[PDB]
Design a protein around this ligand. Structure first.
Ligand SMILES: CCCCCCCCCCCC(=O)O
Ligand SMILES: CCCCCCCCCCCC(=O)O
Lengths: 25, 269, 250, 177, 250, 269, 250, 25
């Protein structure tokens, strides 16, 4: 799963909701 | 996330005035550059991304430095710290959040252990950090059974191990952390955010057993807010913070010093 | 540029207002089957409660510096509302706040009318003091900005208005739901407030969701005979809800 | 009664002829004395909780012995009801002992917030007073006292969170191998 | 042969009853858009009001001759209901009357429980006397049948129970909504009463639509130790309605 | 994993009583909020996930601290530890599991070596940890051939190497680990869980050869239960644990102290 | 509200019971071809074994504090069952436990009847003591809660009932298969128990899969002539299975 | 192989049954 900001990959290696990186907008 | 652009404007001679409004309404008057001046036409790139909530509080800051002083002798008796958890302790941070009446978010806690050596050597030091929830048994010795952490969350750090850090799911029992609180106790007492934002407490203790070298542990604690929402913005803190969980601010025998710089005369800045 | 507000068996007018403003832009409503936690049939007294309740007029002069009241509480004695308030542990509501104050074409002066959420004031003192329940629970009378020694300054809120009472600057107050009464333009202000707070309902007693605040930003000047005018306050709660039916606390 | 069974029972008098309190307890699952009960003890391993509670009462007196109690939960925000009037204005349940020994009754989760602290400060979940609705009545030739038991369990409703160490139990000094 | 009645945040039981009886056979309801005359939005406090309100237990002995209370009034102090009662001119409601009284297989005795409409009692005297407001407005305590001189017998209701208090014979009392508590059979009675009266709503104060009456038709005999048992009363109003919102009368 | 929601309830006047039951049955009486009170209607989010077996015991806790004291002189002769393996040694843990009569699960063992320095220097220290099964030859010296670990499982740790840790497949020769045991020996002896839960033993030994600096090794052992099932829940432990593999609890010249707090009068908590 | 249990050549009744309860909710059965490890043709004596075996009635008084027996063992002398028990190394079974105890409408009292798995009691002493085989192997007589010095307290189980004998609180006992005999309501309890234990079969001698426990939670009070009633116990094993056929051990 | 809890990847890098992470429900 990869995207476009202001291309890169980023799935969540972690099982818990909080574990995850910074949100999008 | 973009900013609108600026449109050519023209020599208005309208019976309609947009510039004239009334603030009484309680509204911010809707007037844009073009409204008032024959303007250019500008394609704006400018980005508010950074001006995003998560972009603001989404940065790691310090909230607490918990210094533990190693005492060889009564080793298994002292040599443990406690900290009632909260953010209200470290202005920088505090102020930001204190920007809004409520906030919701998960927390990324990051640690920074610092060994100030005292004997000519450090040796091998191992720290433990048990997050202790309200109700959980509080450790009372460097050897309290409590550090068996059979259900509690504890994280270990030793000399040479890289900065520890973990993640924490928005806690509280209500939709959001209260930044302020116009209320009291079930016992009409403690008018303060203090009523609610008991989160439990953080505890550290060196594991390394009775040894030789007197030394000091300076674990600093750092916090990034994740997955953020907030409501009801409030004016910023104007002066220094006195105490936690209180808005108080009047200081022992000293001026009420704002931030406003004074001047000689208004007809010159 | 006019206005007629009706609630319960009560109706307000004002031959001249700035178009009232809605709290954060959310018209008040009952509690969501989805949000609720009070697992019992809430009581909604409706026309009896959700009606207009007129306060105790306070007197503005060329010397007045400010007043405030906290919501709920204020209307702790006002009919069923008040009653239902104590008889139930929990309650929820939003209100219609209508602040009125006439004068004349021959006066000048300006008031900031502002409703504040979780308005935590600050005791006026250095070190471990707090605020005393009794003091943030004035009732209909409210607090005046009286600068002259109190019986227990150890639990007195700051009498420092311009600091919004909490270490924030007046003037960055507009960040809240607010209007201005500017005698020369309008003669009353109005605000409608939904329930705001991080839980479905909260204790009517232990906590004041709100906090109205008025401040003469602009001193009441006049060459007229009357140099002291009154400021009346009228409030209607809306969508009145109570759970935790039991005995009446005191 | 502290180290016997008798701490688990409550005694009623055929001689009491009035609106008299019989006993009361805080509601918080890890409140005393609940705390030590299965649920309480379990809760004591988490920091948060929410739900309704199922309290059950069993009469034990002779079969010919009758009574009518009043079981009342009083929402926090106020203090222990002193009179029966004061009690019954809250959530309650008039219990008629007749044939079926037991009578379960519920403590509706009724919080300002969603979850609550397993370890409470000065904050409470109200209490559960017990009153004489009628008067424990017997025939001639009958024990004039009556044992009354009390249990607790969580409702379809109940739920815990925030895993943490238990306090209702300790270890000072090592265990022998 | 059992029963569980729930109202507001309150629930009754009785391990043994005679199947409760409905007032005149009409289950209570709100006011008909067609019948109403109160042209204002009535208030319906619902779970808060329409709940169970337990009285003040009176003591029955081998010597007790009767008691009664009048409705409304009785519950003039009982939460919102009471409050809403005075704060409004007009009100309407029906109630659930649950009279409970346990004993034992080793007692005997019988009570007539009867709810009376427009129950006009008669002062106990010869010529121009009437009854004194205060005396037909006892509150939760009710009237006991005390045969021993009163402070103002000039306005005392007759203490003549068997004459139903009004020049009608007890025994032709059953013509009213009634049950019997016969210790040897049942242990509580119950009745549900709609609003009855020749107008939509009436003054909560000036008038008592109802009037419960109990009478030991059959003396409480026993060889048991307890020879005095209590009679508790619990009442839930239903479909609580008030119009004419104003100040609280005293 | 969700919790049911709460449904509007209404003014019951039923000939049917659900609240009235009998505990005699041995059953927990089935009554829900609505049954007894005109209730609201609530959409419940609340999650029991965390309230999951694996979520409980699925947390790492300490079960043993094995302190080894370096003795320069007879170096190749002592300087090795032993530990009869079991969990019955460290309350926190013990109690939880002691929640059920049987448990089955794999184990993640995590290690925490701590070097308490004694000479002004640590030098270079290397530990070995041989898991020694029942039957396997037990080491009897810092140099027992046994530390050739030709088939045994041994794991090495040195100063600077990050916490070691490994995984272990549910052992035992029956479907589950016995938490309790109402039985004896083939020789009517040892009434205890002790009969079965011999797992073998853990052994450590510093590899670093004869050197200079006297020092101490404090390896702490930590254990997370994985892939978990359990049956027959039992009441929790009420007081302190005396000894392992025994339920015993009466203590040398001291009160039977529960956890129950006492009060003045029942008509007031 | 009745009951008739039949096993082998034996049948029980009880004109009044609380509907018996099943162990953990699993009706007993023979050993799964899939689970078994005993690679030999097990013996199933059936009607001869899987029958009702009545114990030795123990006497309850206003002073009795508790009793227990362990399963198997208890029925170590009871017909084929007992015999087959020793003659085989291994055995498996579940049982039907029927605890009966009549009284009268004129008594009061309550017993906790609870079946416990792997019930490891605790010797009543400080430091390295254990329990003595002989003491957790009473037979049909069971253990009484006798608080008065034993011949070898060095291997005596705690006589501390309320601590469930193992450092768990009585009252958190219900977490086990249990019923209550409450004289005023029922007059006997019943429980059916499958084989529970972490292996197919286990030594009939070396280990007791179970452990019944009774405790007068509620003291036997009475004004009647008989103030001491007996408690009888009757047990039927089900699905009786033995492997490891050899000589009879002693 | 990736999923949804209270999206992330997770295969088992390990050959033995026990080696694997915490179970699901
Ligand atoms: C063990 C790590 C502790 C980190 C806690 C972060 C929680 C923030 C709660 C905000 C409460 C407050 O300061 O008002
Ligand atoms: C070498 C690492 C040792 C870890 C062993 C975990 C096995 C747990 C067995 C439980 C037996 C018990 O304590 O009753």
């Amino acid at each position: 799963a990869q995207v476009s900001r202001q291309n890169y990959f980023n799935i969540n290696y972690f099982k818990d909701a909080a574990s995850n990186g910074a949100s999008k907008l | 996330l973009v900013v609108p652009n600026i449109n050519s404007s023209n020599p208005t001679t309208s019976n309609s005035a947009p510039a004239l409004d009334a603030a009484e309404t309680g509204h911010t008057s809707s007037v844009q550059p073009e409204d008032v001046i024959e303007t250019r036409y500008v394609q704006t790139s400018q980005t508010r991304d950074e001006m995003s909530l998560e972009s603001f509080l989404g940065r790691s800051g310090c909230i607490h430095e918990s210094k533990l002083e190693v005492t060889l002798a009564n080793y298994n008796k002292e040599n443990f710290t406690v900290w009632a958890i909260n953010l209200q302790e470290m202005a920088q941070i505090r102020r930001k959040f204190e920007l809004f009446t409520y906030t919701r978010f998960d927390s990324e806690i990051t640690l920074v252990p610092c060994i100030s050596a005292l004997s000519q050597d450090i040796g091998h030091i191992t720290m433990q950090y048990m997050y202790v929830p309200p109700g959980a048994p509080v450790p009372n010795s460097r050897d309290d059974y409590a550090w068996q952490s059979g259900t509690n969350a504890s994280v270990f750090w030793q000399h040479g191990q890289a900065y520890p850090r973990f993640s924490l799911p928005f806690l509280s029992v209500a939709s959001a952390y209260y930044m302020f609180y116009d209320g009291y106790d079930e016992q009409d007492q403690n008018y303060g955010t203090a009523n609610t934002n008991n989160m439990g407490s953080l505890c550290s203790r060196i594991v390394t057993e009775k040894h030789i070298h007197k030394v000091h542990i300076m674990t600093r604690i750092y916090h990034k807010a994740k997955h953020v929402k907030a409501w009801c913005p409030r004016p910023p803190r104007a002066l220094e913070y006195t105490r936690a969980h209180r808005t108080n601010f009047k200081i022992e025998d000293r001026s009420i010093q704002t931030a406003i710089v004074t001047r000689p005369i208004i007809t010159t800045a | 540029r006019i206005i007629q507000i009706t609630r319960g068996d009560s109706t307000i007018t004002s031959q001249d207002v700035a178009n009232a403003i809605v709290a954060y832009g959310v018209w008040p409503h009952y509690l969501s089957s989805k949000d609720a936690s009070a697992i019992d049939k809430p009581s909604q007294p409706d026309t009896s409660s959700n009606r207009f309740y007129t306060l105790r007029s306070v007197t503005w002069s060329s010397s007045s510096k400010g007043w405030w009241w906290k919501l709920p509480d204020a209307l702790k004695d006002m009919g069923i509302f008040g009653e239902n308030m104590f008889y139930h542990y929990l309650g929820r509501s939003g209100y219609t706040i209508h602040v009125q104050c006439n004068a004349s074409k021959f006066h000048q002066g300006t008031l900031i009318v502002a409703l504040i959420p979780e308005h935590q004031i600050a005791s006026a003192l250095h070190g471990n003091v707090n605020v005393g329940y009794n003091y943030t629970h004035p009732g209909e009378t409210g607090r005046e900005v009286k600068a002259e020694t109190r019986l227990n300054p150890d639990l007195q809120p700051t009498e420092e208005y311009w600091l919004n009472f909490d270490g924030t600057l007046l003037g960055n107050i507009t960040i809240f739901p607010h209007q201005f009464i500017n005698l020369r333009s309008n003669n009353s202000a109005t605000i409608i407030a939904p329930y705001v707070n991080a839980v479905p309902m909260d204790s009517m007693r232990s906590h004041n969701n709100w906090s109205l605040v008025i401040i003469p930003i602009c001193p009441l000047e006049t060459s007229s005979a009357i140099n002291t005018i009154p400021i009346t306050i009228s409030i209607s709660p809306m969508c009145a809800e109570f759970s935790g039916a039991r005995a009446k606390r005191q | 009664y502290i180290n016997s069974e008798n701490m688990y029972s409550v005694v009623l008098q055929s001689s009491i002829n009035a609106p008299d309190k019989i006993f009361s307890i805080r509601t918080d699952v890890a409140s005393q004395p609940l705390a030590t009960t299965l649920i309480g003890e379990i809760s004591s391993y988490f920091t948060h909780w929410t739900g309704s509670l199922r309290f059950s009462f069993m009469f034990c007196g002779t079969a010919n012995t009758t009574v009518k109690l009043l079981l009342a939960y009083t929402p926090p925000g106020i203090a222990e009801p002193t009179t029966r009037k004061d009690a019954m204005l809250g959530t309650h349940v008039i219990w008629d002992v007749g044939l079926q020994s037991t009578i379960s009754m519920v403590v509706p989760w009724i919080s300002a917030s969603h979850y609550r602290n397993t370890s409470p400060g000065r904050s409470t979940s109200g209490y559960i007073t017990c009153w004489y609705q009628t008067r424990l009545v017997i025939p001639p030739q009958t024990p004039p006292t009556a044992r009354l038991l009390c249990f607790v369990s969580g409702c379809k409703d109940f739920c815990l969170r925030m895993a943490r160490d238990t306090n209702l139990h300790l270890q000072s000094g090592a265990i022998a191998q």
